[PDB]
Amino acid sequence: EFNILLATDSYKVTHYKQYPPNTSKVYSYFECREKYEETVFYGLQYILNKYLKGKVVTKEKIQEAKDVYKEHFQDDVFNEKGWNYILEKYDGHLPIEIKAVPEGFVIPRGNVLFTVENTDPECYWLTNWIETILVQSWYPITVATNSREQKKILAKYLLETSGNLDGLEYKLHDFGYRGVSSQETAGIGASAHLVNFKGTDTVAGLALIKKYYGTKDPVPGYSVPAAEHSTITAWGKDHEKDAFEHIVTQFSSVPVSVVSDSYDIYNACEKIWGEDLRHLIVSRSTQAPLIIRPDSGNPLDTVLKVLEILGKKFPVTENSKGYKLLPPYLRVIQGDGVDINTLQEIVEGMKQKMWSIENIAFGSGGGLLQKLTRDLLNCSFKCSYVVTNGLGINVFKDPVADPNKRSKKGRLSLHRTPAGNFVTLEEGKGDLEGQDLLHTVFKNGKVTKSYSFDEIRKNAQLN
Template identity: 40%
Template sequence: MSRTNPILNTDSYKLGHFLQYPPGTQALSGYITTRGTSMRPEIVFFGLQAFLKEYLSQPVTAIDIAEAQDIAALHGQPFDRSGWQHILNAHGGFLPLRIEALPEGSFIHRGVPMVQVVSTDPACFWLTSYIETALLRAIWYPSAVATSLRDVKQTLMPYLKNSCDDPDGVIATRLADYGARGATSLEQAGLGGLATLLHFDNTDTLEAIVYARRYYGAKMAGFSVPASEHTTMIAWPQSEEDASFAHMVDQFGDYPTYSVVSDSYDIHNAVSELWGKALQQKVRSKPGTLIVRPDSGDPIDVPVQTVAQLAYHFGTRLNAKGFKVLDDKVRVLQADGVSLRDITMILGRLEGMGFSAENITFGIGASQLQKINRSIYSFTMKCTALMDDKGRWRDISRRPVTMHERLPEVGRRAVVFEANEFTSVRLEELGRRENHLQPVWENGNLLRECSFDEVRQRVRTKHRQDF
């Protein structure tokens, strides 16, 4: 990512908020949560560590201050030159904030704080609210993607439990992320792809792999396979389609798995005549598994027919649950514009025909990375406590007369684990219970670091418990 001026990583109107608080204010405390109620934990918290390492680790510089002052003046906003200069002089440019958070990968009810922020220097108490824009944006997007993909996983799991011998072992390979080109930016592809990898192992979003290494220390967080695309296949004329397929087998048949898009001209001919007859022995002669990719045509009928045709030509075996599994040399991947509704219809139809769900995998793209917004799960950050000039904390909250919405809980919060769920309590009522909102960042220092494997294990263990 290119360097961002930390002072300008906020909303315009926040530039003038340093002038608006009561005299003598010493500190502010606020937290990020999701509005509303839920009968069960449904929110997956993820993405904070990437923000801390990428953005809060960048100190404010004199150049940043000069740029922000110039922009504020031209933009019609006041600017706290002395406050930012104090941050530069007294703190080396690092924001004097303490950030507490739940373990990433935690599952929580709506309304439970996942991150809590408090200012640590009375000279710039206003930073707690100032950072809201950047911090909330950094958390809501990867958390929303991770939450949405958990719902996808829960939708797929019953089909696997019904028809697969090892549904827990199979589930992580049922979806592959091909969403990079549908994202609005490199960062969105990286964060969204990284959130996807919490649930599923397969990805072609390289930036997700980079982010997992850079921010969570993962040597390799996801896997890909050699695969063709239409450009490489139609470079061969239709009269040489058999040669193009044979060339793929020659080039990649020694890999554990390789994928060949097979609908460039006629998917039915490709499956029944080329893969099923002309090239079957060639495919069998290689150690790798061929993944046949039928991209075009009816998104439900074509992949089902492809599985059936491959079963006819390559044969099947029955698993312990009595469902047909294709010969280990072939599998099917449906990846073109497939929706969750399409996936369930495909799996339902295959199950009705006696085929196991493990015969087919699916590709997901922009639908999971793009069709997400903050309002889906109502992510919000609210300041709920203020320290006055006598060092006393007092609750702050709006109390509109005409509104009936459930407002965030006031005061400084703690999160305890009771009845197998996270619950929010007032900090002063914590007692001897463990507070799971643990300090992870203070005044420019990363206090606690989690690995991607730890986060992924937390997510997947909870998924297995749910089933």
């Protein structure tokens, strides 16, 4: 199974010998240091339940870690005594307190999102031990934040080229299962995406949400039948029409997506879809459109040339603001080379050519869930308050060659002014008083406050 004593950076194993004498408390916090001006806080509850809560220390896990580290360091520097103390005194529960803003809250950059401190003075070293596991919440935060920014771009352009926001939550579809680094990442990232949208093909995201968050809806995300290259090319290069015909007929009463660029996307749209199989498309209902999927070439140019061909083979209308609109049984999804930058280029290029955003949805894979780093939001975990010799000092780092790697001081609290802006109070000044938005979510091995996925989606809504 998973062993928390082997779930930290190696140098942190030796930290219990590096503090000043008689150190009783280490206090640390997470923030997205100072374009992404506001971030969605999401993912901590998953980490608390899966890795931190309950009996996480056992006699076998202590023996396992001791053997590994003895060889790893070529020396005895494992704190077997202190880990036995946790096992004996607390039945293997972590004497730790965590306070956090509610999940789904949208918070401007440079504010405390959660804090970590030891509740037993013998475990002063435990705060920075679990930094490694906790700081990985940068990923769901960054995915949920970058996904929400793409929802602003879509909502803005879907509103000027159409006048409404119908189907907005299905306009950016998670295709990223293949392009992420692991099954666990797929689950975490896909659930972070579902904070803002409801279309996904990464099934692991559905499983994570039901197990760790829960929803009133029958399922957190939805998809539609779709073809890949292997289901088309299997019919033979001369039988692409047959492959198309078999697939739209199998799924004639539900939406179906057909990748149409196996050999020539423009021929498939002009000759195959626009003539040979046109009778099978114009007969489809509004609730069961065909979605044509280009998957190669330049993303914007191919989208423009595909829409041009479909426009001169199917009845185009002009909507309430002067933008062109395919018939309700035909749609397009661009799911190749889509990230937040290219997505902006596609929708602007379409608006420039007077096409409505209603005609198109987007699929993002490695760009939505993989090509993201801790430096995008400058997610940072710092120690700000220690107590040595019964004397608490506000600690901080302040490099001379980089003032941007600075950190806050002392005990922190997150507050909201009467005007509404957010402010992080340092040096314990939060005791002088609204009130603190950091609620306790973990204490001494138990999760003390939970949020459902519906509550998270409500907090992360746009204005």
